[PDB]
Amino acid sequence: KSKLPKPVQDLIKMIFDVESMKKAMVEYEIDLQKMPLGKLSKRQIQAAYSILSEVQQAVSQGSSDSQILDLSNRFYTLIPHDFGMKKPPLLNNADSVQAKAEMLDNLLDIEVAYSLLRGGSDDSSKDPIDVNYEKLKTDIKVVDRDSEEAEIIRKYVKNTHATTHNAYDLEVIDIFKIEREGECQRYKPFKQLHNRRLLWHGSRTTNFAGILSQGLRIAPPEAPVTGYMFGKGIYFADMVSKSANYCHTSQGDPIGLILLGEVALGNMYELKHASHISKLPKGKHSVKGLGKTTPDPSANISLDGVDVPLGTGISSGVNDTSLLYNEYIVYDIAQVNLKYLLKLKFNFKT
Ligand SMILES: C[C@]12CCCN1CC1=NNC(=O)c3cc(F)cc4[nH]c2c1c34
């Protein structure tokens, strides 16, 4: 039987739940009878990614929409869906493509998680909790609730919840200090770049088995670069609620996980509208999408030499922007060093 601290044990049970993966799949209206969890393929997902990029290129230069309809039917044949008696959405426009690309990101992560769960070795004497914990190849420690780390993290959550995101409020249940096997060596080349910031990354619970195993990754090459507002990079927020929205929490499942990462942003390429790129212009290290609302720079503090923008929301002074809140994008996985993992209770305002 396991000796892990009991918060870490609940975390492991949460990350490796197959039923949550099946529920995520049912929430995308995927047909679980024709295409169950065990018949999820990495290469099938990549082929779906290629269909999305074919729709992107077709729409972009005046192809038949005959063509685009055929590609949408091919997509629904490659990934079987259960829509009952409604008509499935058509892949004819940019929003359809973006929805399916986010969906495929989560599908790929689910495949990674199930591949982890059913792989490696199994040892009947050992607690499954211990087996999965060491499958994560991460050091997970509980952060003391009265530390100053915890002070700053609670203040970061408390101060940067946007008013637009009025469907819920957040309660911090546990704060974990994580260390990914190998990540600090990979991050070393970027640890004295200027402008390193502690930023949020939310994702579904089922995805953290992937995120803790392999880190935060960039979409595969088959993924359409126009399926993401600022192209194929790793996306962070400085508003806790903007990232928390990407946990895809629900009333039926109100606990989520969110990441705090040291991001070496360096020279930020400032953008107010979508720009589907895979590389930065020479001399830039990150993209910053400017919101009309920013955390107050007055109130930034430092934690292990990293800036924390835990100020309250004020106007940026940016006028012709299409973003309500900031976004930070990096295009090299080495530019990220994950520091903390947070268990959040979503209290839905009903
Ligand atoms: C839809 C998108 C774009 C590429 C994959 N994505 C998933 C995501 N996850 N998590 C975040 O915390 C996040 C925070 C942001 F400020 C902007 C973001 N844009 C994304 C995310 C995101």
Task: DSSP for 173-188, please give it.
Answer: EEEEEEEETTHHHHHG
Query: 278 and 176, same structural domain?
Result: yes
Please check whether residues 109 and 186 belong to one and the same domain: no
Give just the sign of the alpha carbon dihedral 18, 24, 29, 30. Answer: negative
- In short, whether 340's Cβ falls inside 6 Å of ligand 1 is no
Same domain? For 123 and 174 the reply is no
Q: Which domain holds residue 177?
A: 137-349
Distance CA 305, CA 222 (A): 38
- Looking only at the bridges linking them, the beta strands covering 291-295 and 323-325 are parallel
How far is the centre of ligand 1, averaged over its atoms, from the C-alpha of 130 (Å)? Answer: 31
Reduced to 3 states, what is the DSSP secondary structure of residue 49?
helix
Lookup result for tokens 């996306």? 235
DSSP string, 207-237: GHHHHHHH-S-PPPTTS-GGGSTT-SSEEEB
Q: Are residues 254 and 164 in the same domain?
A: yes
Domain count, the chain: 2
Query: Same structural domain for residues 285 and 266?
Result: yes
Instruction: Please identify, among 82, 104, 136, the residue that sits at the C-terminal boundary of a domain.
Output: 136
178 and 230 within one domain = yes
Would you call 287 helix, strand, or coil by DSSP? Answer: strand
Rg (C-alpha) for the chain, rounded Å, is 20
Report the candidate in 199, 175, 201 with the shortest Cα–Cα distance to residue 308. Answer: 199
Residues 125 and 175 in one domain: no
Going by C-alpha positions, the residue among 297, 260, 70 that lies closest to residue 150 is: 260
Residues 87 and 162 in one domain: no
Residues 283, 268: Cα–Cα separation, whole Å: 9
Cα 235 to ligand 1 centre (Å):
5
Amino acid at 69: L
202 lines ligand 1 (CB under 6 A): yes
Nearest CA to ligand 1 atom 4: 228
Instruction: Please check whether residues 18 and 109 belong to one and the same domain.
Output: yes
Helices (H) and strands (E) in the chain, counts: 10, 14
Resolution (angstroms) stands at 2.7
- Does 242 sit in the ligand 1 pocket, CB within 6 Å? yes
Q: Do 22 and 146 lie in a common domain? A: no
Report the separation in Å between the CA atom of 218 and the middle of ligand 1, taken as the mean of its atom positions: 11
Which method resolved this structure? X-ray
* Catalytic status, residue 148: no
